[PDB]
Symmetry: D2
Subunit: 332 residues, 4 copies
């Protein structure tokens, strides 16, 4: 299963890192017109958040060699011009942030990609969250898909379990969210979203979250019943969901823990984790899960009204999910 | 007004700063055995968060002189030993953190203080939120009172306006909270609350909030119906309350804004503010309000289930309320 | 004295703010094609580092009105097309960062600007530091000038005084420098300067400084005798120079203090300041000086070998110098 | 070689971590009266800077079990009372910060420790830097020794090499230094050093460095010829030395690189490293070296005047050096 990456950014590079833990999946090609070959090596090798790459790297014969595997590197702006088929790239991760519609992402099909995975929500491409709705993937009616957002991959598995066991009548969520590449170091222009221009390191910044719309798609039963927002805050990675909902079936906090824990050991294993330790955000740097339920941080007001808390490494967990989605799609 | 301050910490220094903008009140004495006179002047003239003092400062003949007013300074460990009476301190602000029950706070009365205001919640002393339960002050029964906490002073005025009009059935809140002096620069010991020992600048840290208990005392109609939690995040000041409640009477967000905006203009003026701009947390550094409702940031899921957002300068807003309370306590 | 601003960025906006403390200077026009009129008001009104604007602002009849003064606003990309003469703009501050050569900056002369000030070093335009070489400004031969860089405006006045009184045989400097708009929030592409792409908030980052080349231009006698570098560190503003030099004339630290202090009270007044207080970087947020000598932080190894320390608000001090340079140029 | 640790702080815990990579050394006992047994496990297991511990941990029968090795845990305030001999602890790392003199540290000898290593400079105990002066350790008349400071372990090996090959006539250094446990989250009291009280995350803070005095002890030939200072800046770990010196023997930058590189591969291997990559501070999180020379960051003004740059993980490198010093002392 041969993979191409468009945009060698935070997500692109960490998809690359994650792919090395999946023996079936092999990245064969990467495209980024703002990062030439030798610079790709540097950016892959040193990471401020996740530390130095532990394997080997080399630039050789115009190719990026990672753990002995040669990777083709391109510097093209128009994704329709990337020669994926020539490089062997069946599946393409679209992770630039700027080709999120089906029309735009479909450009990778012109270069001979079979399937495109948009590493972000889409206005029209079908969205998926591993552990929640991947069964609805139709191989041969869908070609361009989305892996939703990081917040959607945290919220959806938790929401599924709470809804399946107890029924969410209504709910609202907040993510306390790490700053990202779209934000600014000091107050600068962000013409569409004014607050997102304000210095990331100085500010708690209210913002939209992709999970607000996406959660209703990935779990149809919850559309109109569950939405939310984000505050961008000054940590470079790791985020946390704060889900407040009224329940249909009255319950206790102990039973909530029991079902979530059991899901973490069985059907959602690898996606949903469970902890009872006294954790903070830096404890999830380079965690591979989509959602880590924090038992101690939750609050139960009464039998039908609760606040649940779940951590996610917004970079690393999501990147591992992109790879799981590829492997799941390839087994058809 | 005449006021004495015990403890020249964050709240003590900024109550002193706020007192100079209130012409009713004048601080005449300060006690702290861990800050000598020249160091008190330094600590008062320079502030990393609120900037340099804009008046004049001087040390002269053993007094600290701020805009020409001499202030006597003591270095006493036992509050019973502070001679408030021999400097004319009618109202004493207890802002050390270690004299929070009425028995210990009462020690200032034994040194000629007539009324004592604890700048923190108390287990037994009556708590007050300006603009919520301030008239429940009884100038015949209560010689030591508490001004609750910053987060309480932000949540209580927003809760009152929403409850009085739309009756809050159930509600849960989060405050995204600036780190404080009780936190650590790097991972260090915090034997009672493990999460609070972890590096403040590196971490989003779940924690308890003083408003969880206090809000039920300052608004008894809301006791068993409203609680919440905090997340400590890496900003040095300014916090934001995230309140999600189900309502009794259905409404629209534009009607939510209507009642908040004109409660802002009438009975809660100076305490609850209202804005429609695209603000971020540093826009409230040195703001004087208890609670600034963020119109654009709120979310309405359905006519009876809503998420409200309100900012507060946890240092400066609370300090102006301590002084506003001294005036309200006086004046009878 | 009527001023136009090209690029409403950190420096452009703070030049605007600073101009309001100079009653002779009036900004009549601003050009930025990435910030429309209503957004200009927002970005001017709120500042994460320098706090809210204290005067009045309004958008009216397609103009930005600041303290009652209407300002014409343009959204043109090619500076040759900005109609400065129509707006009354005699002097134009070129503060976009992309028109730093004489040829490019000269475009504002079409559009009938009389003089252009490049808010950054130039490869060929003559550079100036107020208090150091402004006498060399020839108003009949130089229509495009540069105000050097922030670090050059800190280092040059100090260096002048030390060189004039003691002789710098050789010297090297470091600036511990706030991060700027050119840096990234998380590790991203910075193709020419790889270290500058690494997350600004996580990293101490070695970098070039404009003072390395510029100081030899503004003080010819020191060319080849004085250079240096920078470390970008995680504060949003305020920087500090660490100047290490061997001296020709042997001296003592007390005499160094005396000459610097005297210069701060006389010939370099307003540009070079002198303090003996126990200051830190946040104490200079919104300071107007080019260079604040820190007496206590210095070290004298022996009579001819010293380390001097000088603070600067890299945003605000430099912005005030741009305005002083305009006023100085206008008085011809 | 059996080791006891007094004070389970940053250095104590990371000495513990480092000891696990040294097969000869086994920590058998730990004392800290402010961190009980179960809390020790928590604090060891999660670390905001260095990530989760990768081995196993357990509390059993009143002992801390790390990778199957049981560790005796004590909660005693007076080091004279710790029964090291009972636990088998030959060598004791004194890492509390408060028993740094020979008289005080000698208290561990009463409990049956053979040797004490003070994890900090001492006014009178002999100081050592591995790779520089460990030959001067006399296992005949030296039971209490010091491993100097982190900055001294960075500076001394570099200085040795430059002095040995070229001669340092005179020099001054700066360390741009991570904030530490002694600093404050927000502006608080620090009565002896007023700047160290100012909020660590908001400020670049001038400070003293232990290397200023210590370097003259560990390299007698350089006493009076080399001193310096620090700026504390907002990163949680990793620091960097900026060494400016005049040389006796004229040289070129290429030859400086060649000697440092050669030293890094031979006599100073493991202590002094050499890189030519475009590194930043986060690239050295959990690096084990005392000093990593940054070839690209250096500047040569002229053949006898240079600025050299060397990184160090102030926590982890120093901790590994404490263990190397133990193993070196145990051989004898
Ligand atoms: N990092 C997160 O927290 C996170 C989590 C979930 C989803 N996402 C989503 O993943 C996507 C990538 O985000 P990121 O954080 O990696 O941003 P990033 O800035 O790190 O990566 C974007 C990369 O794409 C490249 N690029 C831009 N335009 C291009 C073009 N036309 N052709 C080829 N390459 C191009 C850039 O050089 C850059 O390297 C975004 O849509 C984002 O919303 C991010
Ligand atoms: N800081 C906030 O954001 C905030 C908000 C609301 C309420 N409060 C409450 O206000 C109180 C003070 O908080 P702060 O932030 O000013 O803390 P702080 O630690 O900055 O101030 C405490 C001061 O008290 C002094 N002190 C300690 N023991 C003393 C004693 N025995 N006698 C006299 N002085 C003594 C200390 O030296 C220090 O200067 C706490 O109870 C806190 O919970 C704080
Ligand atoms: N901020 C500092 O610390 C500092 C100090 C000294 C010098 N400078 C210099 O001042 C200049 C501006 O720096 P800044 O910090 O304000 O950066 P910035 O990114 O905040 O400002 C640049 C502004 O110019 C605008 N712009 C870009 N291209 C344009 C064009 N063709 N026409 C009109 N506007 C355009 C952008 O929209 C932006 O608002 C730079 O050259 C910088 O080197 C900055
Ligand atoms: N972190 C660094 O950058 C660094 C580098 C080199 C050296 N050091 C030095 O190492 C020493 C320890 O530093 P740290 O970073 O571990 O500080 P820390 O504050 O993290 O740890 C100190 C520990 O000692 C304990 N302690 C206090 N009093 C005690 C007593 N009477 N008995 C037993 N234990 C007691 C504390 O509870 C704490 O756990 C300091 O002297 C410091 O100067 C630190």
């Amino acid at each position: 299963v041969k993979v191409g990456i468009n945009g060698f950014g935070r997500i692109g590079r960490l998809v690359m890192r994650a792919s090395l833990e999946h023996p079936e999946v092999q990245v064969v090609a990467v495209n980024d017109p703002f990062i030439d070959l030798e610079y790709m090596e540097y950016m892959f090798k040193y990471d401020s958040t996740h530390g130095r790459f532990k394997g080997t790297t080399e630039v050789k014969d115009g190719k990026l060699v990672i753990n002995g595997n040669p990777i083709s590197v391109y510097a093209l702006k128009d994704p329709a011009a990337i020669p994926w088929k020539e490089a062997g790239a069946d599946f393409v991760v679209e992770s630039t942030g700027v080709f999120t519609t089906t029309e735009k992402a479909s450009a990778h099909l012109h270069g001979g990609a079979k399937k495109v995975i948009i590493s972000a929500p889409s206005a029209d491409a079908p969205m998926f969250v591993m552990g929640v709705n991947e069964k609805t993937y139709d191989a041969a009616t869908m070609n361009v898909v989305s892996n939703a957002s990081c917040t959607t991959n945290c919220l959806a598995p938790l929401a599924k379990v709470i809804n399946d066991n107890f029924g969410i009548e209504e709910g609202l969520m907040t993510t306390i969210h790490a700053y990202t590449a779209t934000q600014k170091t000091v107050d600068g222009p962000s013409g569409k979203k004014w607050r997102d221009g304000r210095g990331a390191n100085q500010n708690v910044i209210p913002a939209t979250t992709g999970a607000a719309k996406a959660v209703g798609k990935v779990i149809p039963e919850l559309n109109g019943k569950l939405t939310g927002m984000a505050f961008r805050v000054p940590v470079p990675d790791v985020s946390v969901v704060d889900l407040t909902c009224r329940l249909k079936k009255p319950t206790s906090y102990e039973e909530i823990k029991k079902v979530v824990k059991k899901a973490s050991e069985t059907d959602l294993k690898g996606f949903l984790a469970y902890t009872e330790d006294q954790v903070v955000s830096s404890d999830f740097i380079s965690d591979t899960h989509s959602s880590v339920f924090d038992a101690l941080a939750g609050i139960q007001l009464n039998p039908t009204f609760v606040k649940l808390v779940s951590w996610y490494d917004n970079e690393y967990g999501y990147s591992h999910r992109v790879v799981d989605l590829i492997e799941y799609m390839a087994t058809k």
